């Protein structure tokens, strides 16, 4: 039994995790009270992947909620699915990080890390065969970055062989709500590239553009972005919970998408997306899904694939469909857009097909890209970093917590090195003399 432990630290991660549990409970037919009222027996075939059984037939999510402030915890508990969680797993403090990485990692998180790791150990011991971990956290700078990387470091030390997964919202240039984003982003990504095994980049600007252009919404809110991220998260772990003609377990992906250990930053996407106004005019089929899948506007990281080349791609289909159609469509995408794909790799489109589509769709698809452009997402942050590190703009708050200056330089150098390896393989040729 492949079962996963879920953690959620910070405000953004907690909100996304709440919507994720909403979506998962809807998929598996779990009421907010924790009881089953679904339709098909297949929902109970692999309920233990995310849930744990409780004596009165009930089901408790295998979730651990973390935050330094109590507001997000109260908001989640005072919510639609607030009562589904285990109260003993609500570990939190009473002093916020104040958008301070040093405060989250070194001073305030050091006191709580023992409690969160004790709860994580209790949850992990009960599992028959643990597969991996999940952790939702934004790189804004508060509880998320600091205590998330602390948790990843501790768990990687404790469980060196179980697959680690994270879902993160990168900073954006046009959408920003705090003044110290680049520092926290660089400091967090140092530990992420050191420790994690898969990280799925998410950008608020891309989600807003998807909302305005593809979904044609008028006044999007955070709920829609959490909905999209939840769709991606559910799509990634579809083959552990339902059967299909071709299974794509998390470790299969870990082998397939990652050529070298450090290039494990991925670009997510979902299809179909119709805007509730052009639903009648669209023909939902595998060729059309593939057309929407490899479109620049449909990716959530705010990067242009046309400004790079793909190292790897994974298309997790869900529904009843022919394998010839999928294979031919992936081959056509390879041949028609050959200039945007790496040459050394003979085939770089992993394929997965599941038998149980979403609740209200005949078929759906999840996209997991790995391309060079992603450099442009990191590169901009580095520029901003220099623009505030040339003068030590706000470092005196971090140094107060006991962080030396050199750590910033180390993290910046690691950023630059990671950018250099994505370009290493991105000019399209490599020969002549």
């Amino acid at each position: 039994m492949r079962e996963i432990v879920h953690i959620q630290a910070g405000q953004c991660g907690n909100q996304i995790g709440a919507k994720f549990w909403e979506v998962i409970s809807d998929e598996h037919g779990i009421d907010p009270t924790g009881s089953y009222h679904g339709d098909s027996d297949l929902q109970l075939e692999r309920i233990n992947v995310y849930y744990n059984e409780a004596t009165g037939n009930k089901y408790v999510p295998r979730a651990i909620l973390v935050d330094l402030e109590p507001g997000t915890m109260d908001s989640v508990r005072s919510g639609p699915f607030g009562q589904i969680f285990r109260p003993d797993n609500f570990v939190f403090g009473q002093s916020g990080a104040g958008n301070n990485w040093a405060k989250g990692h070194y001073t305030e998180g050091a006191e709580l890390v023992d409690s969160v790791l004790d709860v994580v150990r209790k949850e992990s011991e009960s599992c028959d065969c643990l597969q991996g971990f999940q952790l939702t956290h934004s790189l804004g700078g508060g509880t998320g970055s600091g205590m998330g990387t602390l948790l990843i470091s501790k768990i990687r030390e404790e469980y060196p062989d179980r697959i680690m997964n994270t879902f993160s919202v990168m900073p954006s240039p046009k959408v920003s709500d705090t003044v110290v984003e680049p520092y926290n982003a660089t400091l967090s990504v140092h530990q992420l590239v050191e420790n994690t095994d898969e990280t799925y980049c998410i950008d608020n600007e891309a989600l807003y553009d998807i909302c305005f252009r593809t979904l044609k919404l008028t006044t999007p809110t955070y709920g829609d972005l959490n909905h999209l991220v939840s769709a991606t998260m559910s799509g990634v772990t579809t083959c552990l919970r339902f059967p299909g003609q071709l299974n794509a377990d998390l470790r299969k992906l870990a082998v397939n998408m990652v050529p070298f250990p450090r290039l494990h930053f991925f670009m997510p996407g979902f299809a179909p997306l119709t805007s509730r106004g052009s639903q009648q005019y669209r023909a939902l089929t595998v060729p059309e899904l593939t057309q929407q899948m490899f479109d620049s506007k449909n990716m959530m990281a705010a990067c242009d694939p046309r400004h790079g080349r793909y190292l790897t791609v994974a298309a997790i289909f869900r529904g009843r469909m022919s394998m010839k159609e999928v294979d031919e469509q992936m081959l056509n995408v390879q041949n028609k857009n050959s200039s945007y794909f790496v040459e050394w790799i003979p085939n770089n489109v992993k394929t997965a097909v599941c038998d149980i589509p979403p609740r209200g769709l005949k078929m759906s698809a999840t996209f997991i890209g790995n391309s060079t452009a992603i450099q442009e997402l990191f590169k901009r942050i580095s520029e901003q970093f220099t623009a505030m590190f040339r003068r030590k703009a706000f470092l005196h708050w971090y140094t107060g917590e006991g962080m030396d200056e050199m750590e910033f330089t180390e993290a910046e150098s690691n950023m630059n090195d990671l950018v250099s390896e994505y370009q290493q393989y991105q000019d399209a040729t490599a020969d002549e003399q």
Partner: protein, 354 residues
Amino acid sequence: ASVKVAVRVRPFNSREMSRDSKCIIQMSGSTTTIVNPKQPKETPKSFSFDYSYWSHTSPEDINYASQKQVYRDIGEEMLQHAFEGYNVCIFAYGQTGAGKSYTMMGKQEKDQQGIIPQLCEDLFSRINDTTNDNMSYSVEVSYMEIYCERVRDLLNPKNKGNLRVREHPLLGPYVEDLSKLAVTSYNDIQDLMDSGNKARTVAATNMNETSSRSHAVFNIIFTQKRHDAETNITTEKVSKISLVDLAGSERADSTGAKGTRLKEGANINKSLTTLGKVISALAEMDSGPNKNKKKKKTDFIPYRDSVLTWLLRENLGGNSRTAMVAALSPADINYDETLSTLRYADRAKQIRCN
């Protein structure tokens, strides 16, 4: 950045001579060829290396690679490089009983010694000879072990905790709270090496009860100090000479134990693969500009894929000389281990034979 690879053959030991033990490795100038013992008559597989050394039989006047000849070939030139001011790295690789200690350390009688005693003795002698009233030399040493991608101290008798690794912006990678003791003569170095080799982590496996489980580094830092009279000493050049003991590559069938043994074997295999990749790309880079000239911008060496290649960043490239020694077991019983050793030795710019 030039890489020179050497492979050496050892004599039989007491156990091998006690049993019915043949010789299976043949060497001609620079080409080494193996022949299967349990399936003859197929085709002795052949490889080419930068140096092939025959110390098997005895001082056989005809083509017998003495220890001093290997020293003059590798260690003396790289010691000249170290004295010039640039960095140096030396690797030792091979399975248990393959005879890598016979080359690195050698016999204790100091008549047919290893690379390390000759290198240290010549270093101290040249330091003594040129020590005039102005030029001042300093030598310091340290010893660390890389175990499951964690650095541990071998000289300090504290509890075996994991030290931290940092990147100084100018001095490059380094290790925090690493013990560093000064030396004056080879006797202190020998005592430190004995204590460190006693302190290292080993475990019993299905091939040897005291098989290595971790990589090791003996770093020696050499500092020059000019003493012109004007107003300054001008530290001038700081040259590092590093010695690396590499654990043997492992297959799960040989080490079938579950738990810590499998994890250790996997980490050793990953680290060795990354090290070979880095050395191969380094050799290609050295060959190109030397002959080709295409500054090829800088391409990119994956220097951050492991801790062993990360700590030795300043010695493995930029401007320095690298070398490696692979010991071969001549017995047929260890044919697979020897074949794996040659297969690893094929790295660092494989060349053409026949």
